[PDB]
Nucleic acid binder design. Structure first.
Lengths: 129, 369, 63
RNA sequence: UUCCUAUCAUUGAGACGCAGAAGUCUCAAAGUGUCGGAUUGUUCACCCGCCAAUAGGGAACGUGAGCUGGGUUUAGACCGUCGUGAGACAGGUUAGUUUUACCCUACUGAUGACUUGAUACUGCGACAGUAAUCCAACUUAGUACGAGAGGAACAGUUGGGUCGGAUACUUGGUAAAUGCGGCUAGCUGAAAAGCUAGUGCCGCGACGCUACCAUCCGUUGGAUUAUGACUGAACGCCUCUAAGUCAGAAUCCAUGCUGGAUAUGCAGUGUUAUUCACCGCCUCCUUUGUUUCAUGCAAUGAUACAGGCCUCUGGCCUGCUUCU
RNA sequence: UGGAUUAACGAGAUUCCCACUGUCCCUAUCUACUAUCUAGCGAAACCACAGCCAAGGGAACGGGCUUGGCAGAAUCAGCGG
RNA sequence: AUAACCGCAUCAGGUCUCCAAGGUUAGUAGCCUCUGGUCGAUAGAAUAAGGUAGAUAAGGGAAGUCGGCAAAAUAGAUCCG
RNA sequence: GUGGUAGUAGCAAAUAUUCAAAUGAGAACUUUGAAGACUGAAGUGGAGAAGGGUUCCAUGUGAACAGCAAUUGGACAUGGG
């Protein structure tokens, strides 16, 4: 039931990986709840579930299609209090087929709208926004 | 052959043709339906667009923004009081509606009278001079017609743009319908408004959906891409800001549904746009419960392209356009509509820091003469 | 009403304005304007700009 | 861009080896929608993924004075097979020019003469075009149903996608306001001021224009389709049908929205030429010239048709074939 | 009619990776010269006759023919059925 | 020889030789200048679409395409490697 | 021989002209001054060859020619070299 946020990452983007599962990278491949536009690259915002490969990381964790969630975003978006947040870097977390995160600890900041949706990623986060 | 990948259409066919309309103010079309039940009231207004600024209000919706402080963009519209002048009966025929008889007031100002001339400076200014001596010798012959016949009645009102900071003077005349009960009492409502300024608080209220008529801001002759929203062609001999294929061979004719180059903007055009604040020109307009600092809703350095020192109204065309407002065609309740409005803070600050000009003077201190 | 302040220039930010850069560690640097943000990209500091309230303060001007 | 339906999804039904969930079959349905990529010139195909669903087709196997030129199909050259050879191959391979609209129409926009006068303002709306449409979460509810696993729906609340129409408060983009500052080379005896390097470069840069890269907004009535029913014969009973009705959809027609120089359409209201100088209106009477059509070119209830009308205890209808 | 290799070299033919980008998602703004308007000057290809459509038949995809829809001066800028 | 030659012409084409200043720099590179030469190329007004050439773009970075085609990015000198 | 097309396409490379006075029937365009630019010594500078053949120089001018204009001219005419 997420509110719209500017979409900062198209399908092609290669982002950083927070958690202790051992992946350095996450290369995005598709997005959950993407409909139908001709020629539009499907893109993901803060907060939301995706699909990904790891490009470098632990060798069992490579060449598979994992689900991830997106946690920081360098593209700017408007909070309703009337200012524009934007983080330093794009980053995400490797996740199970339910929606739970795989590896428990989360480095970096996280967004408000990650912690607002997903209960588990709120707890393990160091400091939100 | 079929299309390959079945995309939706570029642009609506609802609005066509895309050509500049023959009118500078919005003509209303379709007033709301009559309840012989309510008292008699006016169902429309005219005002001039100014500029828009954001405001802070507390949401009352379980959304996640319940009890939180949301900034919102908000247009100020300058609305000095519209002076009622005439009244118009309308017979209902099988062809359509049809005007039976227009009655007018005794004494119109030169504000209204400019509308009837294209050259005011030359003329001897004769408009309603034979009528004025005829009026003193009034029109209770011709008002008796409107009581006997005539399903519909409309007050002729007009603007006061000498009070506005447009360089105008000319003043738009406008029919506004009267929707209450009893065809006699509609005329008695109109008669007692003759040479009286109708203010905005008579018509509209805080927390009300209004349907806004106007004309869009012009861009001249624009191409397919801007005009219709079309894909730009790839990096193509001849050029690439255009459609490739108009049409199939047959029909041996270009169809009207295909998008072409032409006019964009200056189109006559909304519904459900909430009024936040009715104001007064008579200080503390932008002052609220929360901030308690003395302000007028002019921002510093004017509205760019200026002042406003009249009655106005906020709410959720180009600058200096005559908007018309309308009372909504059915009174609707959508939770979103019928909302408690609460304004914390109206902004009156190129890129402004300070809310007021004395606040700037405090910061910089004793400057150099 | 309540009015948070700029990290760079120490000005006041009345609401519906500016922008909050979150850094790598997560210090939320607020700004008023693109003037401020794009000097924080270049990593020029407030102390060397004369117009800023910081250089003002340190060289016996204001207060 | 539009059209078709032999409907993949969405709407409303009916059938089941339909308990629920999930489906399969059929009817009214073309209103709305049918996607992102890897390999191949591909059409097809085959995978990875999303999704409500990734249905099939037509329009000179739509579409080259619209592009592209990867393929096929000239001239150069290579390989293999065939030929004694020149040469050949629906065998493979690489390199190889894509010309013109200013004409007519069509389509998109722009002015514009004229019609029981001029000129000005407010209007009416025939007709044409139309716009919204899908999904998810929260509660409903671990309820209905079920031996258990599993597991709905309507009303209500909150969002999202696609599409459409506006707008620039804020955020972002743009810079030749050459707006202010900084730097290189040259040139003016220097300093100061600048100028040339076709925008000399770098930073910020109002106004404007502008972006799902920003913000706002996207109506409520009638008649019916499939289908299910009511009353009820034909056929002492039964029967949704034969005569009579009723409910009923993402449908249709309105409404609303766009135009109306889309009806050579129509209405109301203002003022109508400095005083011999033209210009009206209403009578009276003469010059000419128009008419698709002068010889009484005539006549005002309102209905019904297995009934009506009244001058109404009676009378009339069976023709404007009459009565003036 | 040479077979198999091969450092250096190639405006040669292929594939992948890093860097980099408006190629792309997704378009937007700015500059000059144009197009546009005026003064002066001023061609050419092309041309049976001409130029609104639906269906019909017909040399089997009509601007003219038959049956319908219709049809209101004169003009400018574009466009590519 | 961007008007005396040849290209049908006072045609953005072609046609052998000599002399060759200052500053910046490795430099007859590019950029600015002195002597000598020239302002010859139809003008004025507006700043629409569409062009021709030239710039710049948040986030992503070849997902575009037959194909990274076009454009970006790299660039000098010294020291290390 | 003459139309329609049509006063239409078009006259947009080589950074650029401006102000005054004189001449003249007439000056955006000739000359002189003053400013402002460009060429930027492997120059649009100063000299030869091939090719051209009087284009050289002066004075004068009604046409035509110099794709606008023209008081100017490699044009036209009469002399000279």
């Amino acid at each position: 039931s997420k509110m719209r946020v500017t979409l900062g990452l198209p399908v092609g983007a290669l982002i950083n990986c927070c958690d202790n599962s051992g992946a350095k990278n996450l290369y995005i491949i598709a997005v959950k709840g993407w409909g139908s536009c001709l020629n539009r690259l499907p893109a993901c915002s803060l907060g939301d579930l995706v699909l990904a490969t790891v490009k470098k990381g632990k060798p069992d964790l490579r060449k598979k299609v994992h689900m991830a969630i997106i946690v920081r975003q360098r593209r700017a978006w408007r909070r309703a209090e009337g200012y524009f947040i934007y983080f330093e870097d794009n980053a995400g977390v490797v996740a199970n087929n339910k929606g739970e995160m795989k590896g428990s600890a989360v480095t970096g900041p996280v967004g408000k709208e990650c912690a607002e949706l997903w209960p588990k990623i709120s707890a393990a986060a160091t400091a939100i926004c | 052959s079929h299309r390959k990948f079945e995309r939706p259409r570029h642009g609506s066919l609802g609005f066509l043709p895309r050509k500049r309309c023959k009118r500078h103010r919005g003509k209303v079309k379709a007033f709301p339906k009559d309840d012989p039940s309510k008292p008699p009231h006016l169902t429309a207004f005219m005002g001039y667009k100014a500029g828009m600024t954001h405001v802070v209000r507390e949401l009352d919706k379980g959304s996640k923004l319940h009890k939180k402080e949301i900034v919102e963009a908000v247009t100020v519209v300058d609305t000095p009081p519209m002076v009622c002048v005439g009244v118009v009966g309308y017979i209902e025929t099988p062809r359509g509606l049809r005007a039976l008889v227009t009655v007018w007031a005794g004494h119109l100002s030169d504000e209204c009278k400019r509308r009837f001339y294209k050259n005011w400076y030359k003329s001897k200014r004769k408009a309603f001079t034979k009528y004025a001596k005829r009026y003193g010798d009034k029109m209770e012959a011709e008002l008796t017609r409107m009581k006997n016949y005539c399903s519909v009645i409309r007050a002729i009102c007009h603007t006061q743009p000498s009070k506005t900071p447009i360089g105008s003077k000319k003043a738009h005349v406008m029919e506004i319908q009267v929707n209450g009960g009893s065809i006699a009492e509609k005329v008695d409502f109109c008669t007692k408004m003759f040479e009286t300024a109708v203010p905005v608080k008579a018509v509209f209220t805080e927390g009300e959906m209004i349907d806004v008529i106007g004309v869009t801001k012009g861009h001249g002759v624009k191409g397919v891409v801007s005009r219709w929203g079309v894909t730009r062609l790839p990096r193509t001999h001849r050029g690439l800001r255009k459609i490739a294929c108009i049409g199939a061979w047959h029909p041996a004719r270009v169809q009207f549904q295909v998008p072409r180059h032409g006019q964009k903007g200056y189109f006559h055009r909304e519904m459900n746009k909430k009024v936040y604040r009715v104001g007064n020109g008579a200080p503390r307009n932008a002052t609220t419960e929360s901030d308690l600092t003395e302000k007028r809703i002019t921002p510093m350095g004017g509205f760019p392209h200026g002042t406003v020192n009249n009655d106005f109204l906020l709410l959720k065309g180009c600058k200096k356009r005559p908007i018309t407002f309308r009372k909504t065609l059915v009174p609707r309740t959508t939770r979103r509509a019928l909302e408690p409005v609460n304004l914390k803070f109206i902004d009156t600050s190129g890129h402004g820091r300070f809310q007021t000009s004395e606040e700037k003077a405090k910061f910089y201190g004793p400057l150099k003469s | 009403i309540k009015t948070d302040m700029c990290s760079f220039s120490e000005y006041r930010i009345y609401p519906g304005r500016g922008q909050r850069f979150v850094a790598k560690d997560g210090k939320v640097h607020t700004f008023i304007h693109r003037k401020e943000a794009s000097l924080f990209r270049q990593k020029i500091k407030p102390v060397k700009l004369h117009w800023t309230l910081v250089w003002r303060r340190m060289n016996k001007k204001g207060g």
